[PDB]
Design a protein around this ligand. Structure first.
Ligand SMILES: CCCCCCCCCCCCC/C=C\[C@H](O)[C@H](N)CO
Ligand SMILES: CCCCCCCCCCCCC/C=C\[C@H](O)[C@H](N)CO
Ligand SMILES: [Cl-]
Ligand SMILES: [Cl-]
Ligand SMILES: [Cl-]
Ligand SMILES: [Cl-]
Ligand SMILES: [Cl-]
Ligand SMILES: [Cl-]
Ligand SMILES: [K+]
Ligand SMILES: [K+]
Ligand code: NA
Ligand code: NA
Lengths: 287, 245, 97, 48, 245, 49, 287, 245
């Protein structure tokens, strides 16, 4: 009272089940009005439509817009991991495997997710398992989810497999593929495929520049698997993991990856061979 | 009446007689964090005019062969004025920005800069050329400070993505024959309500000459580009001693 | 409004007319300083040439906001952006822009 | 202080140097007090 | 719509497509002398259109080194057309004026003229340099006629007063990059209702290049300045034979 | 160029607080500026010379 | 609305024209109530009154409190300056004198003002002039006030004495003493006898430590005086200036000076001879 | 219920189980400057919690022969936390203070400190002893910073005035057998609405042992004294670059 100085979004949602119609138009001849002329410098895309540039007929368009809803674009199971437990070799003659959950190892799904900066969703995981040649044998397996901070099994018979609190699934290689629903688990409000920053404070000496881009809010822990038995199993095992996004929301679209992927954790690209987004031709005046 | 404009905030005012409108990123004005979204319980400090004002950074020179530059936010201001001081003394920070990029020439010069804001601008390396080396960008490249940095491969934005599609992000163009500045208002974007102004850069500002500068010899050849930015609705929390990084 | 002699150089005294305006020209370096002066209106210096300055010298004290308007007299084809700043008490002439 | 924000730019055919005139005055909240004699005039010698 | 203008009075019309508004000296339009203020008892003659019209005087040439010019009113017209004739045949005269100074160049020239009206423009001499000589200006200098005169010391307006403060008088500027003319409407100002058009000059018109003319060689170098003036509400009294001075 | 002085005020160029200004304008009224006795002449009548 | 967190003096004036009365009281014998006991640590002075410590009679006190109103304490003309213009010597054989206005040169008045930190007032100045032996002669004088920034006269006939704008007084040494009213002239809201600070920014090297305590808001300029004439006057002149404070307000009382004054501009005291505020005696048990 | 107390402001809280009430200097709570009294036209910054909080300065040690100490305000904080930063970046400052002086001993120690606030605490020198030398105190003595300074002649407060009368100023006593702290709330006092936090110290805090510390040998001998202060209603104006003095 005795000190006076101490006293939004202009756009929203519409439902568009079908493509816009075309209204019939005729010739327009005059000064002042000029819809064909634009100013791309503004940052806006052109507002001109067919009826302003030509004479149109009427078209009652019933083409649906439903299949391009992000939900239908993403809710299709895709491969996010291939885990192997061979019986001979340097791989894992141990009968168990601990896999750090990182889904950025396969391009098809990755490129689709990276179209957005942030995504929030639930997921359906399907586990397709078989011998490396595709054959199936009566082998009992156990898949266990080990959240960050939970003891990771150190052997085929580590106490951790008691799985008294962690969720585990027991299934036979002969049963259909196991399948479960997973909720949204980040401590953040959304998973983020791009984090322009460092996870901790400190000097960022070239020794720990591998910290750059690592967002802890996306680190979901470990996925462990073993043949259920005190004795070694005679079978090599191939586990393919598929993920299906559901109940999804996405924010901030970005340019799509146009260089092959090199690493799971960063956007590094092969500098000696930078691919052009479009194929080439000889002359700009010839097809 | 759309080409003329004035921006006044704090003890600072910008004028322009050759604008091309103003962009409001994703259609949203910056705003202080609301109680429903907040999580940190301490009452924040909202300095107002001492930090929500225009700061002008170092100027760059546009040459017929420039590749393009970029700056990270809030990195650019972590060590400038009262804003920087608040960013250092607090763990938590949050704000929006008004970005005003300036560049004037003459009716006889030509060229076009694309001015864009790219949220979570994560950079990549050329992987030792062959692609067998998993190298990473050094602090100085990811957080260049107020001087900004230079793009080595603008075509892929030093991140394996096409410049051709950057217009999918909030942007404007400075086309010398049309305007002499770009203005973009950016709201806070993040997966958390507040964050560290030191460890995380919310977005990057890119200024790339897509249509190269040109002019007949005899015409002024020093054509600078100047960046002036203003935090909006700056809020801070988690007070303690000052930390630079 | 009356004219401020910002260009009050010792070398001007014999060609006083040159004191009524100061120059700007194509820079080779960025962020260059073009001119500087005190805002003190009753003090010896640029303000003495203004009717405001002369009149307030007939009074011991003053209070209020001042206003300086700059008119560019280059050719129509010339363009440019300048940053004009008022630095309240405390800091000497700012070293850089 | 007056600084170059960008640069004075001109095309071929126009002067590379130009001038600025500065005009100054008081705003509406301006007032003066305690009338006194000015230092700016002196009778150095007799006026005939 | 403020840059374009037309002035029509009598059988004369002026046009301009690069104006900068019009000044009405001290906020008052000229008007005939009212009966309360008048003192002379004879019915005056108010010729109207034969004298309240535009007269164009001799043109001057603006050079990179010009000092500036001035004209006295009503001296300039005492010998032109019907106005001059009336001024000669009558003891008493009174009128206002519309002053229109013209000067156009090109978008590549530069310079700025200050166009001002100074009531009772009394001139002084340089006093023999040393100041020991009480010299005075000759008729030709105090009343230069329609050709006007040249200032020898514009900085002090040949009268011991600062050009820097002349803007305290009704004025406009002709800044080549902005406009090509100045227009000032002046009302009668004097301590008496009517006066001699021969013995007393009510005011002086000064045209001084404060920002010198400049241009690259090759551009037109003849940049003239033309003065066109129109008496307004001219009234005369005290008829007798014609007197030139 | 118009001949007018700038119409801009503090509130248009910066963010201002409210200030209830009571500074008087009376001492600059021409009457108070001039109504102060000043010397206009010195006359002398000596006895020798 | 969507952000909740974004949403005086317990004592005043009374008129006391007379000293408080004394109400009759009797004996009080009991527990719990104990008015004689205090706690000076609080910072408050004792609230106990006569009736609480003894048996009192009734007394209708009509003693006035008016003479201790600050106005009556200060509005008494006191000497603030003695200016001399002798005819022979090194003093001022020039016939004129310029005196920097500083009233702290005489103790009586100074100690009274320094009882407060800030004072605001108007003043009546009286100018008592005579020859040094007290005799009076038909001499015409001119006293002129030269505010800060006004040209100071440099001679008995400097143009400055034209006094076209500065206020001047012309009076004879034989007329009564000249007297005028002066308004409150500081650019501050009050004159301050103590300014714990420096007048300007910068490093405060020992070379300019004389800046300490100098408040420009108290510097009122120069007071000039001359014998009115082109020729030198044969008389030595003694001018005593008296000041009478009127329309006064005062803030923040402080301890009274208890060491002799040494300089007009600071509180420096003679360290080798620090006087005790009270006289002394031999024993604490004897008068 | 007058001996116990808690002070919470900003992200800081003080507790005491042996208080002796709280003093409000001259009966007035600090408050922001009102529009009627203000003169500077720029909207000030009122940081709130980042500057109106408790800061604890360096501790002093009380000995059987200590003379006494003093600190100047706002000098003590010109270089501490966000408050100092704001004081440096702005020409104008204004605020009040909550002063809390701490000192605890045992039921077997004794002594009494007088804790007082003296507005405009101007210091004097001993004038070269004889009094013929017009010496002055050096910066380090007039503005001792956060470490404070020592009185050389407490009896006259190093300023020619009697300590015996200091109780005429807002104060409290820390009498070891009674309490272990003093609390004084101080409102802004000055002849101007805002001022420089660097050139002018509004008041001084004096802590003088009037009744000397004493105790039987064997009892703890390290009896510190700690000063914790909190700006209240801190306001700043006249933003520019940072200045330390
Ligand atoms: C018993 C079956 C357990 C199955 C548990 C699977 C949990 C996986 C949760 C999906 C988390 C989304 C992926 C998050 C982050 C990305 O991988 C990041 N790029 C890793 O840095
Ligand atoms: C024609 C008669 C002119 C008389 C003018 C007398 C003006 C004096 C005004 C009184 C000002 C109060 C004194 C102010 C400050 C103290 O002297 C300070 N200690 C000086 O540093
Ligand atoms: Cl088991
Ligand atoms: Cl490239
Ligand atoms: Cl000044
Ligand atoms: Cl000249
Ligand atoms: Cl005289
Ligand atoms: Cl002592
Ligand atoms: K449709
Ligand atoms: K009574
Ligand atoms: Na259009
Ligand atoms: Na009691």
């Amino acid at each position: 009272d005795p000190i006076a100085d101490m006293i939004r979004s202009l756009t929203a949602l519409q439902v568009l089940p079908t493509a816009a119609n075309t209204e019939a138009s005729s010739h327009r001849l005059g000064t002042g009005v000029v819809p064909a002329l634009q100013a791309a410098e503004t940052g806006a895309s052109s507002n001109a439509s067919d009826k302003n540039l030509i004479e149109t007929r009427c078209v009652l368009n019933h083409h649906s817009t439903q299949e391009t809803a992000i939900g239908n674009f993403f809710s299709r199971a895709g491969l996010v991991s291939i885990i192997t437990m061979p019986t001979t070799g340097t791989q894992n003659t141990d009968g168990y495997v601990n896999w750090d959950i990182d889904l950025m190892g396969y391009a098809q799904l990755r490129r689709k997710c990276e179209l957005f900066t942030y995504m929030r969703f639930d997921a359906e995981f399907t586990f397709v398992v078989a011998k490396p040649n595709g054959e199936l044998v009566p082998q009992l397996l156990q898949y266990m989810y080990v959240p960050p901070g939970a003891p990771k099994p150190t052997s085929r018979d580590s106490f951790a497999w008691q799985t008294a609190t962690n969720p585990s699934v027991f299934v036979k290689m002969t049963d259909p593929p196991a399948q479960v629903s997973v909720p949204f688990m980040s401590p953040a409000s959304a998973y983020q495929w791009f984090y322009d920053g460092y996870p901790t404070f400190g000097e960022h000496l070239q020794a720990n520049d591998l910290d750059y881009g690592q967002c802890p809010n996306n680190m979901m822990g470990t996925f462990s698997i073993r043949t259920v038995g005190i004795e070694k199993s005679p079978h090599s095992i191939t586990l393919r993991v598929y993920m299906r996004i559901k109940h999804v929301r996405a924010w901030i679209p970005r340019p799509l990856r146009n260089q092959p992927y090199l690493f799971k954790t960063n956007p590094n690209y092969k500098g000696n061979d930078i691919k052009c987004t479009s194929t080439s031709r000889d002359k700009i005046t010839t097809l | 009446s759309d080409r003329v404009a004035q921006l006044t905030i704090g003890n600072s005012t910008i004028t322009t007689q050759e604008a091309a409108n103003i962009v409001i990123a994703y259609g949203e004005w910056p705003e202080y964090c609301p109680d429903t979204d907040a999580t940190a319980v301490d009452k924040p400090t909202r300095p107002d005019v001492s930090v929500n004002r225009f700061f002008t950074l170092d100027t760059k020179s546009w040459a017929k062969d420039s590749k393009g530059w970029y700056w990270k936010f809030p990195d650019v201001l972590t060590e400038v004025g009262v804003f920087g001081q608040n960013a250092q003394f607090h763990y938590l920070y949050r704000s929006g920005f008004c970005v005003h990029v300036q560049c004037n020439a003459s009716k006889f010069h030509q060229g076009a800069l694309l001015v864009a804001v790219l949220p979570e601008y994560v950079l990549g390396t050329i992987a030792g050329g062959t692609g067998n080396e998993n190298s990473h960008p050094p602090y100085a490249t990811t957080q260049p400070g107020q001087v900004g940095a230079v793009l080595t491969h603008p075509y892929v934005l030093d991140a394996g993505i096409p410049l051709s599609q950057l217009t999918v992000c909030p942007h404007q163009w400075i086309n010398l024959r049309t305007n002499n500045c770009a203005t973009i208002i950016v709201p806070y974007m993040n997966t958390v309500p507040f964050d560290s102004a030191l460890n995380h850069c919310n977005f990057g500002l890119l200024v790339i000459p897509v249509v190269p500068l040109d002019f007949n010899t005899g015409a002024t050849s020093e054509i600078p580009i100047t960046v002036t930015i203003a935090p909006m609705c700056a809020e801070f929390a988690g007070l303690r001693q000052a930390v630079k990084q | 409004e009356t004219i401020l002699e910002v260009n009050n150089l010792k070398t001007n005294e014999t060609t006083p007319m040159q004191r009524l305006c100061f120059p700007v020209s194509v820079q080779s370096k960025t962020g260059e300083l073009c001119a500087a002066f005190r805002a003190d209106p009753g003090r010896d210096g640029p303000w003495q040439s203004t009717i405001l300055g002369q009149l307030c010298r007939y009074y011991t004290q003053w209070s209020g906001s001042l206003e300086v308007t700059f008119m560019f007299a280059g050719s129509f084809m010339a363009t440019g952006k300048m940053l004009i700043a008022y630095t309240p008490p405390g800091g000497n002439v700012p070293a850089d822009r | 202080t007056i600084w170059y924000q960008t640069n004075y730019v001109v095309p071929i055919g126009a002067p590379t140097t130009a001038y600025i005139v500065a005009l100054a005055a008081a705003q509406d909240n301006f007032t003066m007090k305690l009338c006194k004699d000015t230092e700016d005039i002196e009778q150095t010698a007799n006026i005939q």
